[PDB]
Design a protein. Structure first.
Lengths: 219, 219
């Protein structure tokens, strides 16, 4: 699916990317590059098939953070990603796994269009580049490096979410996850089990504690 | 409801009760007092109103622990208690909130009778005593003191399970809970978030680690 987006090259690579083993040498952009200057960026990533439970709290977290000064960063994927980003509009930044002349995934086209208009989409791929395993992985590192904090509402083991969670640890980004029952989100529960992530046991307090840590007003 | 239990004096008060600020001065018993001389006693306590999820794993915990050399200790209450005890039979000990000439609660009479017959019931009251305010708290102190480890599968804030949880901490009895969703078991979740309990993220590993720790053959 062609995007028909009008895009250009990003003038300056965010310094947040310098922590990366292999920073992007060149980035392409469509939308509001001012979003890159915001004080609080929160990554929200997760499974392509969240439960109603996960979906419900993903919406609240995204909506409330975006409404109170944060910018939500994600990969625009089916499920948790696109849910967070739609509910954060227009304070949201997407890292694309393909070049900006294409929409992926197809079914998210409507929301992705709205991000291109009112939010920001970045890509490391100039044109004609359909997504492949390595480009999903590569853009995940950008999602993590760009963000101050990383939330994973729900995720299985051996998922992109878990490789991103490893990156979050490697790059010292605080990891947060939703409390989940046995067997429903083994990835996030493993992170809890090993003390590699903090549980979000109260949505409003978590949000307010984040706002304060970054000198924004609470709710 | 009368029990028709031919209860005895429990002649030797278990040393485990000696840690209490107010040890029971006299105890009464019916059933197998040898259960008191076992290497591993696990308290399983919780809400009177468990979800199907909590119920399902309580059954598994109780059954597997009882089958592999542990004894399950509880209060015989509606919900988690009676579920755990029924599935632990005959390796189970009930601490009764009433004298042993009565059944309490009435609706648990069948399992409670099975416990009198094949497990063990203890009480701090001799006769003619139905429970009153505080007698539940009182027998809970006994459940905790007797047990090596305490499992709370599900519980609300301000419940009896939480006051028992405070006792477990006071006496350094390790405390474990089931992973629970936001807004379902605020009691156990608060324990988890405050680092006061450990989560059971893998039922089989939890059990095998517990066993090993008490020099029992792993499953």
């Amino acid at each position: 699916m062609k995007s028909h987006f009008q895009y250009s090259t990003l003038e300056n690579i965010p310094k947040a990317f310098d922590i990366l083993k292999d920073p992007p040498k060149k980035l392409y952009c469509v939308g509001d590059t001012k979003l890159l200057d915001t004080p609080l960026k929160v990554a929200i990533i997760g499974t392509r098939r969240p439960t109603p439970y996960s979906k419900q709290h993903t919406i609240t977290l995204a909506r409330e953070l975006a409404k109170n000064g944060a910018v939500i960063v994600s990969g625009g994927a089916l499920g948790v990603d696109i849910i967070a980003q739609e509910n954060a509009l227009p304070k949201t930044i997407m890292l694309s796994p393909c070049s900006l002349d294409f929409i992926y995934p197809t079914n998210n086209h409507k929301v992705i269009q709205e991000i291109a208009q009112n939010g920001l989409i970045l890509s490391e791929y100039e044109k004609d580049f359909m997504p492949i395993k390595g480009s999903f992985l590569a853009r995940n590192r950008l999602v993590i490096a760009l963000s101050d904090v990383v939330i994973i509402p729900q995720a299985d083991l051996k998922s992109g979410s878990m490789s991103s969670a490893r990156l979050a640890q490697k790059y010292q980004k605080p990891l947060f996850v939703l409390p989940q029952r046995l067997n429903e989100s083994d990835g996030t529960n493993e992170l809890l089990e090993k003390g590699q992530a903090q549980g979000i046991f109260n949505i409003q307090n978590f949000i307010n504690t984040l706002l304060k840590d970054y000198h924004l007003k609470e709710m």
